[PDB]
Amino acid sequence: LALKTIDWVAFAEIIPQNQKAIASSLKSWNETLTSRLAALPENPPAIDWAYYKANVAKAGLVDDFEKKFNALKVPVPEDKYTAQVDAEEKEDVKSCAEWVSLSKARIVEYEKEMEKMKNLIPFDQMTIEDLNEAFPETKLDKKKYPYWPHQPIENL
Amino acid sequence: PPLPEYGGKVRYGLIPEEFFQFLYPKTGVTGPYVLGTGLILYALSKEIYVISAETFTALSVLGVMVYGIKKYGPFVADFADKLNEQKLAQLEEAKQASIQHIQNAIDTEKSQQALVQKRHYLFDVQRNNIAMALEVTYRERLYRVYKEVKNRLDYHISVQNMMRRKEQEHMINWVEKHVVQSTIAKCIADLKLLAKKA
Amino acid sequence: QKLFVDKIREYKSKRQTSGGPVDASSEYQQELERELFKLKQMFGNADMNTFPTFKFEDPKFEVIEKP
């Protein structure tokens, strides 16, 4: 009975909006099973036979009732359900690690690009081609507007 | 390549200071002006500069030009300087804005990585519920079997008890009703005890 | 001793019950069947003089993995 303590807002953040209902049902069943494990102890109080040896005046029936009980093999239910969610967790950790590697690629790209923007030439020593290769948004569309000023006159 | 800061230090808008310095060592500080006076007077006296209507056209244009620069030169200088400062500030702010955009993007990505690292709670919750359900069913089974066996044993004890009860009640009322079915000795003994009443 | 004669003679008459399950009742069964019916039926319905055989169910479970 070694349980995994859980955050509930953290549990909320990792649930896609197409299975919020299942998350809430898991939550309600977690709470219900906590409650029901609270209100019942672990092992029944096995009543002493003394009050049942000296006051059942019937012929040896108590003794077979107690023999059938001391030799009772009550069935402990086995899991049959945790291994497959462990397999699903393995698959999910695979997906998560590959997406993480992609995000680390994007992050290293962003850090290279931010070093590029961080090390620009001072703007008073900058040609126009240096600006057009720094912020390429600032390049005249010499394709659509081939004649001077290479932009709409209202833009000027 | 950065531009210099200052120009070439002309004097009267016509003559650079290099000339006055160049004539300093040999004719002092008054050499250039003496030379200018001499050249003007030689041009005048010998009809190299013919005074005509163009003298006064030139005087009027030169007066308008000197007055123009002196009065609206500060304004034009400050206008050019403000144009450059505004373009510089706009470019710097665009730079800082792009820096901030990509820094925010990096932060967003690291936050997504934090979330994806937090992912595992779904499976530990499901595993919790499986273990707890199996334990609940086990304990329900043990209470059911205990309570059933005890209920049978207590039914035995209860049937025994109420059989004994009905039987003893019938016993006592039989023995009372049956001694009624059964004496001068007690006749005298009553008076004996009445005398013993004292 | 009226009631002492009662007590002792009558307890002796009672102990004379070798062949008597209920000491010369001749009755008291017509209601004892009702009493035992009531008692057993309010304790249970099956035969409560034999050991109970145990059927056990198992918990349900669903498709929980990411669809």
Amino acid making up residue B187: C
Task: Verify that A34 and A1 share a domain, yes or no.
Answer: yes
- Is A153 part of any domain? yes
Point out which residues pair with B16 in neighbouring strands.
Answer: B10
CA–CA dist A135, A121 (Å, integer): 13
Residue A10 lies in a domain: yes
Kindly state whether residue A155 falls inside one of the protein's structural domains: yes
Claim to verify: residue A1 and residue A37 sit in the same structural domain? yes
Residue with tokens 């808008």: B13
- List all residues 6 or more positions away from B159 whose beta carbon is below 8 Å from its beta carbon: C36, C39, C40
**Would residue A70 count as lying in a domain?**
no
Distance CA C22, CA C29 (A): 10
Q: Does residue A115 form part of some domain?
A: yes
Which of A68, A81, A92 is opposite residue C61, by nearest beta carbon?
A81
Q: Do C6 and B152 touch (CB under 8 A)?
A: no
Bridge partners for B11 per DSSP: B15
User: CB of A37 within 8 A of CB of B136?
Assistant: yes
Whether residues A7 and A34 fall in one domain: yes
The one-character DSSP state at B49 is S
Judge: A61–C49 Cβ closer than 8 Å, yes or no: yes
What's phi and psi for B15, nearest 5 deg? Answer: -125, 120
The residue segments making up the domain with residue A142 are 122-156
| Nearest CA-CA partner of B122 in A89, C53, C50, C60 | A89
User: Per-residue DSSP letters for C7-48?
Assistant: HHHHHHHHH--TT-SSSS-S-SHHHHHHHHHHHHHHH-SS-T
- Inside any domain, residue A35: yes
Q: Calculate the dihedral angle through the C-alpha atoms of B76, B77, B81, B82, rounding to the nearest 10 degrees.
A: -40
For chain A, how many structural domains are there in total?
A: 3
Name the minimum distance, in Å, from the CA of B181 to any CA of chain C.
10
Restricting to C residues 1-30, those with a Cβ less than 8 Å away from any Cβ of A are none
Residues A1/B134, Cβ–Cβ less than 8 Å: no
The SS3 of residue B165 is helix
8 A C-beta contact, residue B15 and residue B32: yes
d(CA B68, CA B52): 25
DSSP class per residue in B51-86: -SHHHHHHHHHHHHHHHHHHHHHHHHHHHHHHHHHH
- Which residues neighbour A13 within 8 Å (Cβ) at sequence distance 6 or greater? B115, B118
Closest CB from A40, A62, A93 relative to B153: A62
- Total residues belonging to chain B: 198
Q: Do A2 and A37 fall within a single domain?
A: yes
- Nominal resolution in Å? 3.6
For residue A60, tell me if it sits in a domain.
Answer: no
Q: A109 and A136 in one domain?
A: no
Instruction: Compute the distance between CA of residue B116 and CA of residue B122 in angstroms, rounded to an integer.
Output: 12
For the stretch C32-37, contacts whose Cβ atoms lie closer than 8 Å and that sit 24 or more positions apart, written own/partner, are: C32/B163, C32/B166, C35/B162, C35/B166, C36/B159
In this structure, the answer to whether residues A18 and A37 fall within a common structural domain is: yes
Q: Are residues A88 and A115 in the same domain?
A: yes
Residues 6+ apart with CB under 8 A from B134: A77, A78, A79, C59
The helix (H) or strand (E) run that includes residue B10 is strand B10-11
Chain B residues with CB under 8 Å of A61 CB are 156
Q: How far apart are the first and last CA of chain B?
A: 149
* Neighbour-count burial for A108-141, b at 16+ CB within 10 Å, e otherwise: eebeeebeeeeeeeebeeeeeeebeebeeeeeee
Could you check whether the bond before residue A136 is cis, i.e. omega within 30 degrees of 0?
Answer: no
HEC string of chain A equals CCCCCCCCHHHHHCCCCCCHHHHHHHHHHHHHHHHHHHCCCCCCCCCCCHHHHCCCCCCCHHHHHHHHHHCCCCCCCCCCCHHHHHHHHHHHHHHHHHHHHHHHHHHHHHHHHHHHHHCCCCHHHCCHHHHHHHCHHHCCCCCCCCCCCCCCCCCC
| Domain co-membership, A126 together with A144 | yes
Q: What are B108's two structure tokens?
A: 């967003």
Handedness of CA A142, A148, A154, A156 (dihedral sign): positive
Evaluate whether residue A68 is within a structural domain. Answer: no
A112 and A147 together in one domain? no
Long-range contacts of C54-59 (CB under 8 A, 24+ apart): C54/A74, C54/B144, C54/B145, C54/B148, C56/A75, C56/B141, C58/A77, C58/B137, C59/A77, C59/B133, C59/B134, C59/B137
